[PDB]
């Protein structure tokens, strides 16, 4: 009896579809299996994931899997709540109300304001992508004027490639004569390497300097293989390798061919692919949970709309899943938000990146 | 010969569907008339906004004259961008590329850059909605780090009309303690009195403030009916009542019956309404350019796309268009913005608003 689902997969996403694939064939059973559609798109073209997402309706679906970006994601979050779709991401969350969207990425915001607490700081920059989200940005603004901090907020989003040499010239012109040190990175990977090159480049206290990096995955690829030269660096992580749970799928994901699994055969996961995996162990959850309760379950612009029935019925069968998974113990708020997670505090330090402490909501920052 | 338009109008836009109407009548002919099909809709709701936009596209439109907002701007410019089919807008303009999408709005972020230099501010509030637009916010926090601007930016946006008495207390914590009386306020009408009131309210330096409004319509509405209480207050207004034009204009719209055109029968209109009628002569003008150059001229999920092949030479006669309208002189680059406009610099004064200069994108601020 196999259950028919979606897949929205951005173009080169490929460990997270190899961390998909593996996580079907962990999660599957003899009897009951997932089926999925694969659409490979480019997530930040609306009309293209209005397309997939129709044509997965069309098909008969009972869940999507799959990614969206800033340009996007209004697209997905209407048309699920309009045809009550269930939507599963490892894509950033969203603050507002989203019916039939399950966000598995946790929210970073308040981690984030609970680590510029704990160093102390009160004066700082904060470099964002404009290729990026902004609810960070409102949080730290809003945060700045209650707890009086002097934020320098850049915009270091749509840089021309070519520009680039002079707006960074511009941007530290401001911050190394203006004596801030302390910088908090928020934007794609790339980018990161791009400014930190900068700051080694134009040498000048160059191990004066204290990064955050604002994302889940502190040790995601050669992040830290970058030449900081001395600086301090801080971030989050999600995947604790240190965990019963992890260590037990690296074992695997270690040993797995290349060829068949293009970005595995590495101790290391990207915490996207992590979430990916875990999204897979959530909807067989939610799907056996409705076999176990003997829940019995096409024109995208149909005027009038015409809402999937059963809908509602898988919507809080995942959104009722309980299960400890790579980004730890996972459970929703019945707007589908990550809630009772722990985010990990990280520091470089002289042996590599170590943990230093723990977030969770309700406890804020722990110090190991 | 009559040439198919679609419009997408918020619902409740009554006086710009007037001015829509009155544009069709002025500027149609005996032989060549715009035949609009209108759709009212919920301009948030993305689903809405592809369902009207693929209705429109099957029926056969020669273009769409419309609205869009923060939430469906991105399914505008996408479907707009893939299938040819342009669209003409009143609505918030954006910095991207964008084929196909022709702004009537002037951008007014150099002219609120420019304001605040003129008056020499270095310290400031900046009150913003979440429910608008943020193109402006980081041109103005990029300005502060240039500027060396202490920026206070609150996102007043959000506000769940419940705790909105608190979410102004700790507001004006921050401010009104902090001695900080210069205000810029870029949100939607409404919030305007709203955060106005809560000055007076707690009353303390009433007369003390200094409010720029960030919006296009200074005088519009009551807007300026407030109780400032001795404040002073600045805006922007890009309808002049005093040019020729204009002045011909209203003295028809100050006579039409209200009943048959809902927000007329005065002697002002909205900066939106403006611009919706200027839209028309927009359209009309370039239609009638393809005529006088003898160029002649279904399924929106059609898979592959199917591009209008005549789609590119509606939108070159479209940003080709040079007239004089009631926003002014009316211009286009290759992008679809608004080039060689000008913006009044408006003051509230002891016998009400005075213009006291104006602002281009090529002299910046010229004070009368
Ligand atoms: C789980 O999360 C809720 C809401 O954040 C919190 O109130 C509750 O105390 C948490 N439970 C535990 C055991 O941390
Ligand atoms: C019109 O706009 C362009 C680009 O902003 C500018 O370079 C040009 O000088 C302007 N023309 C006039 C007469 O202002
Ligand atoms: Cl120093
Ligand atoms: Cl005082």
Request: aromatic fraction near 12%.
């Amino acid at each position: 009896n196999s259950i028919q689902i979606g897949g929205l997969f951005p173009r080169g996403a490929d460990q997270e579809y190899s961390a998909f694939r593996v996580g079907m064939v962990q999660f599957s059973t003899s009897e009951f299996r997932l089926t999925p559609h694969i659409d490979n798109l480019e997530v930040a073209n609306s009309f293209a994931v209005t397309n997939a997402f129709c044509s997965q309706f069309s098909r008969g679906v009972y869940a999507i899997f799959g990614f969206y970006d800033k340009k996007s994601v209004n697209t997905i979050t209407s048309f699920c709540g309009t045809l009550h779709v269930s939507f599963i991401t490892p894509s950033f969350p969203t603050d507002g109300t989203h019916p039939f969207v399950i966000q598995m990425r946790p929210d970073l915001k308040g981690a984030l304001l609970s680590l510029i607490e704990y160093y102390q700081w009160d004066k700082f920059a904060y470099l964002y992508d404009s290729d990026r989200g902004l609810s960070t940005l409102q949080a730290v603004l809003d945060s700045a004027a209650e707890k009086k901090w002097q934020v320098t907020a850049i915009n270091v989003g749509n840089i021309n490639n070519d520009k680039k040499d002079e707006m960074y010239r511009s941007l530290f012109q401001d911050l190394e004569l203006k004596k801030e040190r302390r910088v908090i990175l928020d934007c794609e990977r790339d980018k990161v390497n791009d400014i930190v090159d900068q700051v080694i480049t134009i040498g000048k206290h160059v191990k004066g300097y204290h990064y955050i990096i604002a994302n889940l995955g502190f040790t995601d690829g050669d992040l830290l293989k970058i030449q900081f030269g001395g600086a301090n660096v801080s971030g989050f992580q999600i995947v604790d390798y240190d965990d019963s749970l992890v260590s037990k799928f690296i074992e695997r994901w270690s040993t797995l061919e290349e060829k068949e699994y293009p970005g595995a055969h590495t101790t290391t996961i990207k915490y996207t692919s992590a979430l990916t995996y875990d999204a897979v162990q959530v909807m067989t959850e939610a799907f056996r949970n409705l076999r176990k309760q003997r829940i019995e379950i096409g024109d995208c612009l149909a005027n009038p709309a015409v809402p999937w029935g059963q809908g509602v019925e898988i919507e809080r069968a995942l959104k009722q899943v309980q299960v400890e998974g790579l980004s730890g113990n996972i459970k929703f708020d019945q707007n589908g938000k990550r809630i009772n997670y722990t985010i990990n505090i990280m520091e470089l330090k002289t042996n590599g990146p170590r943990k230093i402490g723990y977030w969770s909501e309700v406890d804020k920052m722990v110090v190991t």
